[PDB]
């Protein structure tokens, strides 16, 4: 009997996100405006 297991991982190209002044997306900013003013954990969990 014989058993051989192999694995590998490559550190392919990446990028660093800027710290401040990040530009949000359309769907996110649209959903972020439908949030109520008063606190509501139920509707706030939806965007989470």
């Amino acid at each position: 009997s014989s058993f051989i297991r192999i694995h590998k991982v490559m550190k392919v190209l990446n990028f660093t996100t800027k710290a401040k002044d990040l530009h949000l997306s359309d769907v996110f900013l649209k959903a972020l405006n439908h949030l109520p003013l008063e606190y509501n954990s139920a509707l706030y969990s939806r965007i989470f």
């Binding site: 192999i6 490559m10 392919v12 190209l13």
Partner: protein, 123 residues
């Protein structure tokens, strides 16, 4: 390469093509995190809904926690996705279901001073 892995025997010819394909379209492997509440900055009422989102995140972490999920057979990290708990299989393990921090305690009574504490156990 995945298909030929049945009789790979430490194959290397397709490794170059697989590396080229990975360079063409990679997948997120390693990453650092930061609270998403810091991303909402340029809306009409930023601070109010930002504090509301912080409170919602606190209550969500109180509601859903990784400790709520049952432990895994072999050192797996259980994760909560919806109403089901899946075990993340590490290198060398397989199967459908493959220490860790326990559940937090209830918030103690607010003392005369600001100091209010919460205790977690590594059981």
């Amino acid at each position: 390469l995945a298909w030929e892995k049945g009789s790979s025997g430490l194959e290397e010819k397709t490794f170059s093509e697989w590396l080229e394909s990975v360079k063409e379209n990679p997948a997120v492997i390693d990453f650092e995190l930061a609270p998403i509440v810091d991303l909402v900055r340029n809306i009409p009422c930023a601070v109010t809904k930002r504090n509301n989102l912080r409170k919602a995140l606190q209550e969500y972490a109180a509601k859903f926690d990784p400790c709520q999920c049952a432990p895994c057979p072999n050192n797996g990290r259980p994760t909560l996705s919806g109403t089901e708990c899946l075990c993340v299989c590490q290198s060398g393990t397989y199967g459908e279901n493959c220490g860790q921090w326990g559940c937090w305690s209830s918030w103690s009574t607010c003392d005369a001073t600001y100091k209010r504490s919460r205790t977690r156990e590594c059981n």
